[PDB]
Short mmCIF file of C-alpha atoms and ligand atoms in Angstrom, two decimals:
data_model
loop_
_atom_site.label_atom_id
_atom_site.label_comp_id
_atom_site.label_asym_id
_atom_site.label_seq_id
_atom_site.Cartn_x
_atom_site.Cartn_y
_atom_site.Cartn_z
CA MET A 1 45.11 -32.92 -39.69
CA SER A 2 43.38 -29.02 -38.48
CA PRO A 3 39.92 -28.67 -39.78
CA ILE A 4 39.92 -25.69 -41.76
CA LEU A 5 37.06 -23.13 -41.86
CA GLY A 6 36.80 -20.86 -44.80
CA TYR A 7 35.11 -18.36 -45.22
CA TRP A 8 35.56 -14.40 -45.94
CA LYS A 9 37.76 -11.99 -43.88
CA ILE A 10 34.68 -10.76 -41.74
CA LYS A 11 32.63 -11.19 -38.45
CA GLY A 12 29.47 -12.08 -40.84
CA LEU A 13 28.08 -15.96 -40.83
CA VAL A 14 31.14 -17.86 -38.80
CA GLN A 15 31.38 -15.41 -36.14
CA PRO A 16 30.15 -17.23 -33.18
CA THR A 17 31.87 -20.38 -35.05
CA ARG A 18 35.24 -18.85 -34.19
CA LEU A 19 34.11 -17.76 -31.03
CA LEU A 20 33.03 -21.59 -29.88
CA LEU A 21 36.19 -22.72 -31.65
CA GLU A 22 37.90 -20.49 -29.59
CA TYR A 23 36.50 -21.70 -26.08
CA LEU A 24 37.05 -24.90 -26.44
CA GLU A 25 40.58 -24.30 -27.47
CA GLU A 26 40.67 -26.42 -30.32
CA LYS A 27 42.81 -25.53 -33.54
CA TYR A 28 41.90 -25.08 -36.32
CA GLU A 29 43.17 -23.47 -39.64
CA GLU A 30 40.99 -20.35 -42.11
CA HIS A 31 40.29 -19.91 -45.30
CA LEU A 32 39.96 -15.94 -45.48
CA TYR A 33 38.77 -14.92 -48.82
CA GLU A 34 39.26 -11.25 -49.14
CA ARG A 35 37.06 -8.84 -50.71
CA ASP A 36 39.39 -8.59 -54.00
CA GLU A 37 38.66 -12.21 -54.13
CA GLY A 38 35.98 -13.76 -55.64
CA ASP A 39 37.24 -15.19 -58.76
CA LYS A 40 39.41 -17.12 -55.73
CA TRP A 41 35.99 -18.49 -54.23
CA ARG A 42 34.06 -19.56 -57.68
CA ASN A 43 36.92 -21.34 -58.93
CA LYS A 44 37.76 -23.12 -56.16
CA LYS A 45 34.51 -23.28 -55.21
CA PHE A 46 33.37 -26.99 -56.64
CA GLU A 47 36.97 -28.75 -56.65
CA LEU A 48 36.56 -29.12 -52.19
CA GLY A 49 34.68 -32.02 -51.97
CA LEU A 50 31.49 -30.02 -50.97
CA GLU A 51 27.94 -31.57 -51.29
CA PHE A 52 25.60 -27.82 -51.12
CA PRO A 53 29.44 -25.47 -52.44
CA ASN A 54 28.50 -22.08 -49.70
CA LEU A 55 30.73 -20.47 -47.57
CA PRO A 56 31.92 -20.81 -44.81
CA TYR A 57 32.86 -24.78 -44.90
CA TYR A 58 33.98 -26.16 -42.86
CA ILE A 59 36.25 -29.78 -43.30
CA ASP A 60 37.00 -31.85 -41.53
CA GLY A 61 37.72 -35.21 -42.45
CA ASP A 62 34.68 -36.80 -41.06
CA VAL A 63 33.02 -34.30 -42.53
CA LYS A 64 32.50 -31.04 -45.52
CA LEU A 65 29.32 -29.59 -44.54
CA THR A 66 29.05 -25.94 -45.56
CA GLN A 67 25.98 -24.09 -43.87
CA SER A 68 26.78 -22.10 -40.86
CA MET A 69 24.29 -23.68 -38.78
CA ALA A 70 25.00 -27.04 -39.13
CA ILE A 71 29.09 -26.08 -38.81
CA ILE A 72 28.12 -24.30 -35.35
CA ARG A 73 26.01 -27.34 -34.23
CA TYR A 74 28.16 -30.17 -35.55
CA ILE A 75 31.50 -29.15 -33.42
CA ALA A 76 28.79 -28.44 -30.50
CA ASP A 77 27.33 -31.40 -30.71
CA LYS A 78 31.59 -33.63 -30.85
CA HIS A 79 32.22 -31.73 -27.58
CA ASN A 80 28.28 -32.88 -26.14
CA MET A 81 27.26 -29.31 -25.77
CA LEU A 82 23.98 -29.86 -27.97
CA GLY A 83 21.08 -31.06 -25.85
CA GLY A 84 20.84 -34.03 -23.84
CA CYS A 85 17.07 -34.93 -24.54
CA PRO A 86 14.14 -34.40 -26.48
CA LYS A 87 13.42 -31.29 -24.26
CA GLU A 88 17.26 -30.34 -23.54
CA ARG A 89 18.58 -30.08 -27.49
CA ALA A 90 14.81 -27.82 -28.21
CA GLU A 91 15.36 -25.74 -25.56
CA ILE A 92 19.08 -25.19 -27.41
CA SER A 93 17.40 -24.70 -30.51
CA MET A 94 14.88 -22.42 -29.92
CA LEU A 95 17.44 -20.33 -28.30
CA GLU A 96 19.58 -20.65 -31.96
CA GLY A 97 16.68 -19.13 -33.89
CA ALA A 98 15.46 -16.38 -30.83
CA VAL A 99 18.92 -14.98 -32.07
CA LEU A 100 18.65 -15.53 -35.36
CA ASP A 101 15.73 -13.13 -35.41
CA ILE A 102 18.17 -10.22 -33.94
CA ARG A 103 21.16 -11.08 -35.77
CA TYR A 104 19.58 -12.01 -39.75
CA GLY A 105 16.92 -9.53 -38.89
CA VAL A 106 20.11 -6.73 -39.13
CA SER A 107 21.24 -8.14 -42.59
CA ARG A 108 17.98 -8.91 -43.93
CA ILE A 109 17.64 -4.53 -44.08
CA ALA A 110 21.38 -4.44 -44.89
CA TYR A 111 22.47 -3.71 -48.37
CA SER A 112 19.31 -2.03 -49.04
CA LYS A 113 19.62 1.62 -50.13
CA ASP A 114 15.95 2.33 -48.29
CA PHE A 115 18.34 0.41 -44.61
CA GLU A 116 17.97 3.61 -42.99
CA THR A 117 14.05 3.59 -43.16
CA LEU A 118 13.97 0.69 -42.54
CA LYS A 119 15.99 1.29 -39.68
CA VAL A 120 13.72 3.05 -38.01
CA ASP A 121 11.27 0.27 -38.27
CA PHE A 122 13.34 -2.66 -37.27
CA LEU A 123 15.15 -0.57 -33.61
CA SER A 124 10.78 -0.81 -33.07
CA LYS A 125 11.16 -4.72 -32.81
CA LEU A 126 14.59 -4.85 -30.88
CA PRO A 127 14.03 -4.09 -27.33
CA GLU A 128 11.23 -7.03 -27.59
CA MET A 129 13.69 -8.99 -28.57
CA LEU A 130 16.30 -8.23 -26.65
CA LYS A 131 13.59 -8.52 -23.41
CA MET A 132 13.39 -11.79 -23.76
CA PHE A 133 16.27 -12.52 -23.12
CA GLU A 134 16.94 -9.78 -20.42
CA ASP A 135 14.20 -12.16 -18.91
CA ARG A 136 16.11 -15.10 -19.53
CA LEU A 137 19.09 -14.41 -17.66
CA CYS A 138 17.46 -12.75 -14.73
CA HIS A 139 18.53 -16.03 -13.06
CA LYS A 140 21.20 -17.72 -15.34
CA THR A 141 24.75 -16.69 -15.93
CA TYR A 142 24.49 -17.69 -19.23
CA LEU A 143 21.47 -18.41 -21.67
CA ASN A 144 21.17 -22.42 -20.47
CA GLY A 145 22.53 -22.36 -17.05
CA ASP A 146 26.37 -21.96 -15.52
CA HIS A 147 28.01 -23.21 -18.74
CA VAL A 148 28.44 -21.92 -22.30
CA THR A 149 26.32 -23.53 -25.29
CA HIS A 150 26.47 -22.18 -28.74
CA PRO A 151 23.96 -19.57 -28.49
CA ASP A 152 25.66 -17.51 -25.86
CA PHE A 153 28.13 -16.62 -28.98
CA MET A 154 25.23 -16.16 -31.23
CA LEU A 155 23.73 -13.65 -28.54
CA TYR A 156 27.68 -12.09 -28.18
CA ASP A 157 27.64 -11.90 -32.06
CA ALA A 158 24.20 -10.34 -31.94
CA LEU A 159 24.47 -7.48 -29.37
CA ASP A 160 28.12 -6.82 -30.74
CA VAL A 161 26.19 -6.35 -33.95
CA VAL A 162 22.99 -4.56 -33.06
CA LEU A 163 25.58 -1.46 -31.51
CA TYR A 164 27.29 -0.60 -33.75
CA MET A 165 23.28 -0.02 -35.22
CA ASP A 166 22.01 1.25 -32.37
CA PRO A 167 24.83 2.19 -29.38
CA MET A 168 22.21 2.88 -26.66
CA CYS A 169 20.35 -0.15 -27.63
CA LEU A 170 21.47 -1.76 -24.84
CA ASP A 171 20.53 0.82 -21.52
CA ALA A 172 17.71 -0.54 -20.12
CA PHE A 173 19.09 -4.06 -20.45
CA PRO A 174 21.20 -4.20 -18.13
CA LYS A 175 21.96 -8.52 -17.75
CA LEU A 176 22.06 -8.41 -21.37
CA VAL A 177 24.76 -5.59 -20.84
CA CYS A 178 26.97 -7.65 -18.00
CA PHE A 179 26.16 -10.92 -19.80
CA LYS A 180 28.46 -9.01 -23.13
CA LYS A 181 31.56 -8.10 -20.34
CA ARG A 182 30.39 -12.01 -19.39
CA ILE A 183 31.96 -13.40 -22.71
CA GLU A 184 34.45 -10.85 -22.97
CA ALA A 185 36.12 -11.91 -19.73
CA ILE A 186 36.21 -15.50 -20.17
CA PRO A 187 40.46 -16.00 -20.85
CA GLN A 188 40.36 -17.60 -24.66
CA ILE A 189 37.50 -15.36 -25.35
CA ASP A 190 40.38 -12.36 -23.99
CA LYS A 191 43.09 -13.83 -25.63
CA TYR A 192 41.22 -13.78 -28.92
CA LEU A 193 39.87 -10.65 -29.27
CA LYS A 194 43.57 -9.35 -28.29
CA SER A 195 44.80 -12.18 -30.90
CA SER A 196 45.77 -11.11 -34.23
CA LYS A 197 43.45 -13.62 -35.83
CA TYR A 198 40.27 -11.20 -33.88
CA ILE A 199 38.64 -10.00 -37.36
CA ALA A 200 36.69 -6.75 -35.87
CA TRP A 201 35.37 -5.35 -38.99
CA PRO A 202 33.16 -5.59 -40.85
CA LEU A 203 30.37 -6.77 -39.83
CA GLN A 204 28.39 -8.04 -42.42
CA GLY A 205 30.22 -8.63 -46.41
CA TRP A 206 32.04 -5.33 -47.79
CA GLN A 207 29.42 -4.02 -50.02
CA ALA A 208 26.36 -4.04 -47.27
CA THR A 209 24.89 -0.71 -46.36
CA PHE A 210 25.25 -1.13 -42.63
CA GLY A 211 28.34 -3.18 -41.63
CA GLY A 212 30.50 -3.32 -44.85
CA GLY A 213 33.29 -0.96 -46.23
CA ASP A 214 36.55 -0.63 -43.75
CA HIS A 215 34.53 1.40 -41.65
CA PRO A 216 32.35 3.09 -39.13
CA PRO A 217 29.58 2.25 -37.81
CA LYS A 218 25.65 2.57 -39.48
CA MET B 1 -3.12 -34.80 -23.96
CA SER B 2 -3.25 -33.14 -27.55
CA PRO B 3 -0.41 -30.95 -28.40
CA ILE B 4 -1.21 -27.81 -29.44
CA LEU B 5 0.21 -26.00 -32.45
CA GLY B 6 -0.49 -22.32 -33.34
CA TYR B 7 0.71 -20.51 -35.92
CA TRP B 8 -1.41 -17.59 -38.84
CA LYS B 9 -3.52 -19.68 -40.74
CA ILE B 10 -1.20 -19.53 -43.86
CA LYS B 11 1.15 -21.74 -45.08
CA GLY B 12 4.03 -19.52 -43.85
CA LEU B 13 7.15 -20.57 -41.72
CA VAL B 14 5.12 -24.06 -40.31
CA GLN B 15 3.84 -26.19 -43.45
CA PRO B 16 6.38 -28.55 -43.06
CA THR B 17 5.90 -29.65 -39.45
CA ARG B 18 2.18 -29.85 -40.30
CA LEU B 19 3.63 -32.16 -43.11
CA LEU B 20 5.68 -33.59 -40.94
CA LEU B 21 3.32 -34.35 -38.01
CA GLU B 22 0.66 -35.61 -40.89
CA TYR B 23 2.46 -38.48 -42.09
CA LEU B 24 4.21 -39.73 -38.35
CA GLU B 25 0.26 -39.84 -38.04
CA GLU B 26 0.60 -38.28 -34.60
CA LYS B 27 -2.48 -35.94 -33.16
CA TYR B 28 -2.51 -32.71 -32.72
CA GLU B 29 -4.97 -29.44 -32.25
CA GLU B 30 -3.77 -26.08 -33.37
CA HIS B 31 -4.91 -22.40 -32.87
CA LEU B 32 -5.11 -20.68 -36.47
CA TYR B 33 -5.59 -17.21 -36.65
CA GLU B 34 -6.94 -15.78 -39.31
CA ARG B 35 -6.48 -12.55 -40.60
CA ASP B 36 -8.88 -10.20 -38.85
CA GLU B 37 -7.63 -11.83 -36.02
CA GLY B 38 -3.51 -10.26 -34.84
CA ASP B 39 -5.76 -8.87 -31.60
CA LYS B 40 -6.55 -12.36 -30.40
CA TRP B 41 -2.49 -13.28 -30.47
CA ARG B 42 -1.57 -9.86 -28.76
CA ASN B 43 -3.15 -11.01 -26.18
CA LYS B 44 -3.06 -14.97 -25.01
CA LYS B 45 0.90 -13.52 -26.60
CA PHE B 46 2.17 -13.12 -23.41
CA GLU B 47 -1.00 -16.04 -20.87
CA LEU B 48 0.57 -18.70 -22.86
CA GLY B 49 3.83 -19.81 -20.76
CA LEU B 50 5.86 -19.08 -23.82
CA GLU B 51 10.15 -18.29 -22.43
CA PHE B 52 10.42 -16.56 -25.53
CA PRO B 53 6.35 -15.76 -27.25
CA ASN B 54 6.14 -15.95 -30.85
CA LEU B 55 4.12 -17.89 -34.08
CA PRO B 56 4.42 -20.99 -34.27
CA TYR B 57 4.68 -22.10 -31.38
CA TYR B 58 4.57 -26.10 -30.24
CA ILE B 59 2.79 -27.30 -26.57
CA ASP B 60 3.41 -30.07 -24.88
CA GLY B 61 3.75 -30.16 -21.61
CA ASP B 62 7.20 -31.55 -21.68
CA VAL B 63 7.40 -28.86 -23.58
CA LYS B 64 6.15 -24.82 -25.14
CA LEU B 65 8.74 -24.02 -28.15
CA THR B 66 8.46 -21.01 -30.29
CA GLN B 67 11.10 -21.27 -33.27
CA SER B 68 9.44 -22.98 -36.10
CA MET B 69 12.90 -24.79 -36.48
CA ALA B 70 12.89 -25.80 -32.89
CA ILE B 71 9.55 -27.31 -32.99
CA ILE B 72 9.84 -29.41 -36.22
CA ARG B 73 13.42 -31.01 -34.93
CA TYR B 74 12.33 -31.63 -31.62
CA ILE B 75 8.70 -33.31 -32.93
CA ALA B 76 11.49 -35.41 -35.70
CA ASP B 77 13.56 -35.58 -32.21
CA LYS B 78 10.60 -37.24 -30.67
CA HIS B 79 11.34 -40.30 -32.97
CA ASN B 80 14.39 -40.37 -33.91
CA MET B 81 14.55 -38.70 -36.95
CA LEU B 82 17.31 -36.59 -36.43
CA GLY B 83 20.83 -37.77 -36.27
CA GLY B 84 22.37 -40.71 -35.34
CA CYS B 85 25.75 -39.17 -34.95
CA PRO B 86 27.50 -36.02 -35.29
CA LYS B 87 27.77 -36.64 -38.99
CA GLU B 88 24.52 -37.26 -39.27
CA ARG B 89 22.89 -34.81 -37.58
CA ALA B 90 25.62 -31.93 -39.48
CA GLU B 91 24.14 -33.66 -42.69
CA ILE B 92 20.31 -33.45 -41.93
CA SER B 93 21.31 -29.90 -40.24
CA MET B 94 23.38 -28.96 -43.69
CA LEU B 95 20.34 -29.85 -45.59
CA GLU B 96 17.76 -28.31 -43.63
CA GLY B 97 19.51 -24.60 -43.95
CA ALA B 98 20.22 -25.56 -47.46
CA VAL B 99 16.76 -25.24 -47.88
CA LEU B 100 15.63 -22.75 -45.38
CA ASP B 101 18.24 -20.58 -48.16
CA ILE B 102 15.19 -21.35 -50.79
CA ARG B 103 12.62 -20.45 -49.01
CA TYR B 104 13.78 -17.66 -46.82
CA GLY B 105 15.13 -16.24 -50.27
CA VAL B 106 11.34 -16.56 -51.40
CA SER B 107 9.88 -14.51 -47.62
CA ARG B 108 13.79 -11.94 -47.84
CA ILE B 109 11.69 -10.67 -50.78
CA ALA B 110 8.30 -10.80 -50.70
CA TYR B 111 6.32 -7.84 -49.17
CA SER B 112 9.17 -5.08 -51.19
CA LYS B 113 7.33 -3.21 -53.47
CA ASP B 114 10.09 -3.75 -55.20
CA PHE B 115 9.11 -7.45 -54.84
CA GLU B 116 9.56 -7.21 -59.17
CA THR B 117 13.07 -5.94 -60.23
CA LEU B 118 13.51 -8.22 -56.72
CA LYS B 119 12.07 -11.54 -58.05
CA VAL B 120 14.28 -11.58 -61.71
CA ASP B 121 17.51 -11.15 -59.30
CA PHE B 122 16.92 -13.88 -57.09
CA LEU B 123 15.51 -16.79 -59.68
CA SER B 124 19.50 -16.19 -61.40
CA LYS B 125 20.42 -17.92 -58.04
CA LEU B 126 16.92 -20.53 -57.91
CA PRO B 127 18.91 -22.33 -60.47
CA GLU B 128 22.31 -23.12 -58.80
CA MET B 129 20.67 -23.68 -55.36
CA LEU B 130 17.86 -26.49 -56.89
CA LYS B 131 20.93 -27.71 -59.12
CA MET B 132 22.29 -29.32 -55.60
CA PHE B 133 19.50 -30.95 -54.36
CA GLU B 134 18.87 -32.60 -58.06
CA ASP B 135 22.39 -34.01 -57.61
CA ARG B 136 21.60 -34.82 -54.12
CA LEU B 137 19.04 -36.98 -55.26
CA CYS B 138 20.67 -38.14 -58.15
CA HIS B 139 20.79 -42.05 -56.26
CA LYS B 140 18.52 -41.65 -53.49
CA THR B 141 14.34 -41.62 -52.88
CA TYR B 142 14.85 -39.21 -50.14
CA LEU B 143 17.24 -36.62 -49.44
CA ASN B 144 19.41 -38.74 -46.70
CA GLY B 145 18.32 -41.77 -48.57
CA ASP B 146 15.35 -44.51 -48.78
CA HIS B 147 13.96 -42.83 -45.32
CA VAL B 148 12.23 -39.77 -45.32
CA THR B 149 13.17 -37.30 -42.65
CA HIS B 150 12.02 -33.44 -41.66
CA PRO B 151 14.58 -31.76 -44.50
CA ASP B 152 12.14 -33.39 -47.59
CA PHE B 153 9.02 -31.65 -46.16
CA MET B 154 11.06 -28.77 -46.06
CA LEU B 155 11.72 -29.25 -49.77
CA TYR B 156 8.85 -30.02 -50.60
CA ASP B 157 7.19 -27.25 -49.08
CA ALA B 158 10.18 -25.11 -50.46
CA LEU B 159 9.31 -26.49 -54.21
CA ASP B 160 5.50 -25.73 -53.73
CA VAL B 161 6.43 -22.52 -53.07
CA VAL B 162 8.79 -21.39 -55.84
CA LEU B 163 6.59 -22.83 -58.05
CA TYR B 164 3.94 -20.60 -57.61
CA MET B 165 6.81 -17.56 -58.75
CA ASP B 166 8.08 -19.39 -61.97
CA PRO B 167 5.91 -22.15 -62.76
CA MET B 168 8.96 -22.84 -65.07
CA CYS B 169 11.79 -23.30 -63.02
CA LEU B 170 11.63 -27.37 -62.01
CA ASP B 171 12.03 -28.02 -65.93
CA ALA B 172 15.13 -29.15 -65.99
CA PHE B 173 15.18 -30.82 -62.83
CA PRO B 174 13.42 -33.89 -63.41
CA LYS B 175 14.07 -35.75 -60.34
CA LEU B 176 13.77 -32.79 -57.92
CA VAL B 177 9.81 -33.00 -60.22
CA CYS B 178 9.01 -37.01 -59.45
CA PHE B 179 10.68 -35.82 -55.42
CA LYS B 180 7.90 -33.77 -55.92
CA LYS B 181 5.45 -36.41 -57.22
CA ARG B 182 6.96 -38.32 -54.74
CA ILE B 183 5.82 -37.01 -51.34
CA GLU B 184 2.20 -36.35 -52.57
CA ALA B 185 1.91 -40.24 -52.73
CA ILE B 186 3.09 -40.56 -49.59
CA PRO B 187 -0.65 -41.85 -48.07
CA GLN B 188 -0.65 -39.60 -45.18
CA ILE B 189 0.16 -36.79 -47.05
CA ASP B 190 -2.28 -38.12 -49.72
CA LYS B 191 -4.88 -38.11 -47.01
CA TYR B 192 -4.13 -34.74 -45.81
CA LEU B 193 -4.14 -32.78 -49.07
CA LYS B 194 -7.30 -33.57 -49.45
CA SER B 195 -8.49 -32.81 -46.12
CA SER B 196 -10.64 -29.90 -44.81
CA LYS B 197 -7.27 -29.34 -42.77
CA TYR B 198 -5.08 -28.56 -45.69
CA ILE B 199 -4.07 -24.26 -45.95
CA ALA B 200 -3.28 -24.39 -49.40
CA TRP B 201 -2.94 -20.65 -49.45
CA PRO B 202 -1.61 -17.49 -48.84
CA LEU B 203 1.87 -19.12 -49.04
CA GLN B 204 3.13 -15.95 -47.06
CA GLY B 205 0.76 -14.11 -44.45
CA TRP B 206 -2.36 -12.20 -45.97
CA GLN B 207 -0.09 -8.82 -46.40
CA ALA B 208 2.85 -9.86 -48.74
CA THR B 209 3.74 -8.54 -52.19
CA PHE B 210 3.85 -12.20 -53.23
CA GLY B 211 2.37 -14.97 -51.86
CA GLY B 212 -0.26 -13.22 -49.76
CA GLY B 213 -3.91 -12.56 -50.63
CA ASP B 214 -5.90 -15.12 -51.46
CA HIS B 215 -5.73 -15.48 -54.10
CA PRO B 216 -3.76 -16.67 -57.65
CA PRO B 217 0.20 -16.53 -58.18
CA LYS B 218 2.83 -13.70 -58.36
O1 LIG C 301 17.68 -18.10 -46.73
C1 LIG C 301 17.87 -18.25 -45.10
C2 LIG C 301 18.37 -18.67 -44.52
C3 LIG C 301 19.87 -19.66 -45.22
C4 LIG C 301 20.06 -20.86 -45.29
C5 LIG C 301 19.69 -20.62 -43.56
C6 LIG C 301 19.01 -20.39 -42.85
C7 LIG C 301 18.35 -19.30 -43.18
N1 LIG C 301 17.99 -16.87 -44.36
C8 LIG C 301 18.50 -15.88 -45.20
C9 LIG C 301 18.12 -14.18 -44.89
O2 LIG C 301 19.15 -13.41 -45.59
N2 LIG C 301 17.08 -13.79 -43.89
C10 LIG C 301 16.50 -12.54 -43.85
C11 LIG C 301 16.29 -12.45 -42.49
C12 LIG C 301 15.27 -13.91 -41.67
C13 LIG C 301 14.57 -13.62 -40.19
C14 LIG C 301 13.70 -14.38 -39.87
C15 LIG C 301 13.53 -15.23 -40.29
C16 LIG C 301 14.70 -15.28 -41.80
C17 LIG C 301 15.43 -14.70 -42.14
C18 LIG C 301 16.64 -14.88 -43.59
C19 LIG C 301 16.73 -16.42 -42.90
#
């Protein structure tokens, strides 16, 4: 039957998996927990059969899985998108972790009261990270060529996210901008983003110092 | 010719890759940068041919690679250790990210002046993370059975590391303790740990609030 994807009803860790499932035109159900609903989760937490209980979880009946990167790589794996030979698979994994750099970087410093003096710091590093993708896309449509791999949706979510921190960070990175529009112009992604299903906010969990609330940026 | 592994001469991100190379009895050379030696790196940084310049890097001549997880998964991949089918590969990736939870968790909070009020926090979560591995090993020799996979050396390094934060954190987790002794009793790991090659400290980069210096714990 339909896979279950469970996470908080935020963007957070699972957003790229959602966009990949949407792109692959795959059926899945979600358990979203809303913010009053910790208790819900803590209960079910250990009755679900996960060996490493966590959120997000992905249950299949081939598979019960709890790490966001194990989940997105599995879905991709199931569709042959993962690699191809050690070299190609390493390519994709290096792209993966090159965008976690950016995205986990937001997250390190969201939740600090010190966010604001932290922010200024992390924005000095951003453009050097960005330039690396911009250079990558200087001759490709997608991160790995003419074909969407899972890290393209990781990068879309990173870009989506760092644009709330500093709406000007992609002036200067015109390929990166077009890449963004390009993902939004895939018709499954277009549909989904118009969907009742699309969770537009928060970026992180509701309590965080940036991306939280049910809000506005910074 | 021999692969090059470049990192700071600390344990840090690359320690599990080193132990895997050692276990697989593979030849590699390292470029270690010492602490006076930022400038060294920044120079070479962009003359090395890495598409995403970073440390650690791994150069092969099939491959120039810069994300620690892309590097260790490649070396493992090259030796067939990675997976086997989408399900098995997801198993290994979930174990991977279940131990980054612990290890990146140290790292989040090393480098803060607030480490000490941060420490107390993170130690409340540790035992719940630990219990998950302890339960996992309750019937296996290694994380995935009777055979070492790359996440076993990830877990060894995590354990090695959280033992400096709280030398008592594994009283209570006797399987975890034996797993540690068990990795140290593999003869390639035994040799290496006795080696001139073994970098015993620092755990993180020299400037960090825990695991830094050329030191003692906490
Ligand atoms: O614990 C982790 C793991 C959890 C398991 C799956 C892998 C990551 N973290 C979570 C986290 O918040 N950060 C802070 C930001 C950051 C930046 C660079 C490198 C690492 C990190 C870590 C990664």
